[PDB]
Amino acid sequence: KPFSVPNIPMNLMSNSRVPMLIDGMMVSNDQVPQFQNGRVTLDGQLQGTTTVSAACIARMRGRIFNNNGNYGVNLAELDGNPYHAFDSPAPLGFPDFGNCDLHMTFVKINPTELSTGDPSGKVVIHSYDATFAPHLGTVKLEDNNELDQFVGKEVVLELTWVSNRTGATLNLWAVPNYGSNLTQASQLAPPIYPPGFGEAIVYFTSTFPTVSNPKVPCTLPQEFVSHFVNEQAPTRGDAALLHYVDPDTHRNLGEFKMYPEGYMTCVPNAGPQTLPINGVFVFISWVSRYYQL
Amino acid sequence: KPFSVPNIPMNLMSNSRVPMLIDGMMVSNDQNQVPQFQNGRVTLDGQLQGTTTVSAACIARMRGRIFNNNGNYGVNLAELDGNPYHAFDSPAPLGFPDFGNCDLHMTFVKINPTELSTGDPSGKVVIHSYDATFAPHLGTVKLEDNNELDQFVGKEVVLELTWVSNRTGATLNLWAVPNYGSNLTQASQLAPPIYPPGFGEAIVYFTSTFPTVSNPKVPCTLPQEFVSHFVNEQAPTRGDAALLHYVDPDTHRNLGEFKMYPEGYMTCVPNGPQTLPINGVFVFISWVSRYYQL
Ligand SMILES: CC(=O)N[C@@H]1[C@@H](O[C@@H]2O[C@H](CO)[C@H](O)[C@H](O)[C@H]2O[C@@H]2O[C@@H](C)[C@@H](O)[C@@H](O)[C@@H]2O)[C@H](O[C@@H]2O[C@@H](C)[C@@H](O)[C@@H](O)[C@@H]2O)[C@@H](CO)O[C@@H]1O
Ligand SMILES: CC(=O)N[C@@H]1[C@@H](O[C@@H]2O[C@H](CO)[C@H](O)[C@H](O)[C@H]2O[C@@H]2O[C@@H](C)[C@@H](O)[C@@H](O)[C@@H]2O)[C@H](O[C@@H]2O[C@@H](C)[C@@H](O)[C@@H](O)[C@@H]2O)[C@@H](CO)O[C@@H]1O
């Protein structure tokens, strides 16, 4: 197959780290990305905790437990099948926000528990301390006095909002310590560094209640991820040249280079000006690493 | 472009009515039941209908500013990106839940960055998808007062569907079309009903387990990723129906034939699809007659 990117305007696609529309892109004004969601090669090989559907982003699933005066969740994949530690740092879709407080909303998910009554709850999960061990299959839940009815029950959890850990700032580039003190989590997606030639990594942004820093950056729109998995197009050069074009006239508004590892770069600040957010990325051709933006 | 469907296993795709993985297929109990879902609606050549969006990130969500008029609380709706809802193209803002005549239990957060510097931005609220006060087509819905809304009055929030329950006195009917409201002479903008094909065929529904309490299985007529695929491709529709095979991802054995119609739904001839494994991949075989015999 010939390589391509989605022919969908940027502002109709989802962030890959939270399920929110993209409302911008930017280079970092400071900070190394090693996100575990939104990670895929250009030839369609998923990495980290990344999966296909935006319906999976920043969610968890598992059975709530209570032991030794502490609550937690025994994790599974979002479809209810078991999580195998060999395959990934955590179950697919697991939030990749580290060293912070994850404020989750959850619902019972067993049909037999969904015939009557309110199946919903909320809970805080720290993405820190040794009891945060999703690679080992478990995470601690903060006791809010409203978890007892859910002990022994299977639930699905979604990330509602995020706040800083007491004594620390909220760092959206922090990598969660998935393997606790036991091991480095298997199959972590690697850190990304810019290649040179004045180039800077591009982040796609969404406004989201990461309180104190409500702009979540990711390295690929989720629909790019599913596109590459669908296509499995062979990588045929150092970089894929993209033009970001006017959605109606197809005039080029700016050039980008996508690298095989699954991220893109630009040379920013080429006269003050602002790119619109409703443009469309179009694959032009494979180009050498020396292509100058 | 030549026509195609996603080369993704069914169980990795999302329902189009709730953001949940598909975990089954079914045919309706009454094979003459007419679905008129407003999400997951698209033609085979990529024209969106109803409240259908490209991204699964929009499914069953709302956005707007909370108000309090004399003790009556509500939301003045906008599109999910915060731009105004103009009602040009859809019966409600894109992504709006299409569950009718029931109680929508929403979780919400303030979404203005200036309101996201400190503190807990979150809340929850019930919204009835019934009565004249449920009028998303006219840009407003009533919120049930839970005594915890006042801090949010005048604030912009985004809402998401956490769970659903039946309206007192009624069953939870997941085939019900919400009454989105009428605006004088303006078109409803509703995606059309899909009438059962008959003659042995039955509409295929993709299902997800979800907390629609008392009926925890949500049916839809297309996986969400089919929608974005068709929008992306804009492939001319060259026949009156598309023949698909549902294939084992390993053996590549054909597990069953399906017909996809230009209006954006699928049928089969049950002998039903509920018994098929859920990890198969749909593959476009050929354009066929509207009358092609499965
Ligand atoms: C006010 C209240 O607590 N009512 C309880 C019933 O729950 C309500 O039932 C309504 C339909 O008759 C409607 O679905 C409401 O949304 C629902 O209220 C929700 O659920 C309850 C448990 C509370 O958490 C509320 O705060 C919430 O808004 C309840 O009915 C039973 O559960 C509901 C979910 C539904 O499945 C219904 O069919 C069940 O009979 C009954 C019985 O447990 O108790 C209260 O009356
Ligand atoms: C227990 C409590 O109410 N604490 C308040 C602070 O909120 C907590 O702050 C923690 C970091 O120091 C951490 O982020 C917690 O998650 C957070 O608690 C959450 O938010 C509060 C408001 C409550 O709703 C809790 O139930 C919830 O778990 C609070 O800190 C300020 O807000 C938080 C969210 C964070 O942005 C922080 O940087 C802010 O200073 C302070 C100040 O208002 O008041 C309490 O101590």
Side-chain angles (χ1 to χ4, degrees), chain A residues 256-276:
Chain A
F256 297 82
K257 287 159 73 186
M258 285 208 82
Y259 290 88
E261 294 81 6
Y263 67 96
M264 74 178 74
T265 62
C266 69
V267 174
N269 195 30
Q273 53 192 107
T274 298
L275 289 173

Side-chain angles (χ1 to χ4, degrees), chain B residues 186-197:
Chain B
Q186 304 301 299
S188 75
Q189 311 294 353
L190 295 166
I194 303 173
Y195 298 102

Side-chain angles (χ1 to χ4, degrees), chain B residues 18 50 62 69 82 91 117 125 136 163-164 169 174 185 192 243-244 249-250 254 271 277:
Chain B
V18 291
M62 307 173 188
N69 293 325
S117 177
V125 69
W163 66 287
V164 178
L174 303 180
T185 71
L243 175 67
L244 311 182
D250 309 318
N254 176 24
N271 77 271

Side-chain angles (χ1 to χ4, degrees), chain A residues 6-7 53 114 158 212 223 230, chain B residues 7 55 116 160 214 225 232:
Chain A
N7 172 46
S53 183
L114 296 172
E158 61 182 322
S212 86
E223 287 77 9
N230 193 79
Chain B
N7 180 34
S55 185
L116 295 173
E160 59 179 324
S214 88
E225 287 77 9
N232 193 83

Side-chain angles (χ1 to χ4, degrees), chain A residues 108 110-117, chain B residues 166 212-216:
Chain A
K108 293 192 295 185
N110 186 341
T112 68
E113 294 284 341
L114 296 172
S115 74
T116 184
Chain B
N166 66 287
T212 32
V213 177
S214 88
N215 193 3

